[PDB]
Design a protein around this ligand. Sequence first.
Ligand SMILES: Fc1ccc(C#CCNc2ccnc(C(F)(F)F)c2)cc1
Ligand SMILES: Fc1ccc(C#CCNc2ccnc(C(F)(F)F)c2)cc1
Lengths: 205, 205
Amino acid sequence: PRNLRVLLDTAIPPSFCDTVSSVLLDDFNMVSLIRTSPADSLATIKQDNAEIDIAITIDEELKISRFNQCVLGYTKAFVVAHPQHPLCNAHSIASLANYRQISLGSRSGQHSNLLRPVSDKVLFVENFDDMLRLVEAGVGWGIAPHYFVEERLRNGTLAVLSELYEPGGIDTKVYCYYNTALESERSFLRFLESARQRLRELGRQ
Amino acid sequence: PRNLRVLLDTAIPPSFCDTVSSVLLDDFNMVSLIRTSPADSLATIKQDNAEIDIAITIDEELKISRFNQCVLGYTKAFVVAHPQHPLCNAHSIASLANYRQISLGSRSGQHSNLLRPVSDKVLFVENFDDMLRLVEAGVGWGIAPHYFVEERLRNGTLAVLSELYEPGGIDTKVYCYYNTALESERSFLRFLESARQRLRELGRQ
Ligand SMILES: Fc1ccc(C#CCNc2ccnc(C(F)(F)F)c2)cc1
Ligand SMILES: Fc1ccc(C#CCNc2ccnc(C(F)(F)F)c2)cc1
């Protein structure tokens, strides 16, 4: 035993996990890293069989039995669309409720408040890569993490629709859920401090 | 006609409203300022009779007919309790679900995710003053805005319980809901820029 299993959703930057990997490797037998869609994180850890000890995700649930919650920091996500998508005036949310958007589907078909689509023209996809395939094809708009659309936004391939809603990008809170057996661990607090400093650093890029 | 009615919940600092008062006074016949509990803001504007044109509140609702939503910035709120309240070790949320807290009741008895109490020992109050009466009396803990508990926290009269949950204070997003008739107003955009800069300034204090 003593095998730590950590879950990160694909809204967390890959660079972030470096800290996870460096800090708590030494304090456990074996550290395992798993990535899921933000829409599958909570449902994944709520499978007892899955034996997830730590989850780092933007999804929010009030009380998930046998898990505590704490905040690690913030990330950025933008509403993006094809640069010639009808809505590129930025009215903003008013219009979005009526056009197609590629939003992250879930294996359970249900969604939280944070991630439930806003429109009724909705096309579910499993991952951000498919989302942005369809979005770069004019099929609809979509909400995606910063690090996914950085390249494309500065290359004209994509346009931001959410500067009136929240200038600078939709700041999304990043939560850490974890086993009630870890509060009594020195490691875990070292990890929390390091992860918080790390998100704080990534925010400055 | 042309009487602007603006609503602010008591989680927004009073100083903030100064900008509101200065910026849009000149562009309307008459500007009226109304303050409500964060738990009464949305329900208040959803009364058609109330004729609210702008609401500035931390409460969140996905879609409220005849109103658009946008983000103005962030404020801070802390979980506070009597300095000798049992829980002053800061376990954190784990324990809070089982002790009494004075949380903001609503006139409708229903609550959003953001504001629905966490415990089952719950004592509803109408306003933050009553909340902190009972909290300074050891009766329970409570979530209150920064500017309410600043004085008391630096004077030992109060203690913070939520530094492990989110060090620095629970950052709460501040929304602005407004009439679909105001998107077509120059005033409103001036107000948005000014209000956003204002919350950004207040964050630095
Ligand atoms: F017009 C809109 C549409 C959506 C939002 C929002 C929000 C909450 N934040 C997220 C949601 C969905 N997805 C992500 C992320 F996975 F990309 F991070 C982050 C704001 C204005
Ligand atoms: F253990 C806890 C308990 C509650 C929270 C939270 C939250 C959301 N933010 C607010 C909620 C209720 N009230 C306010 C305010 F009105 F004071 F701003 C702000 C975090 C950890």
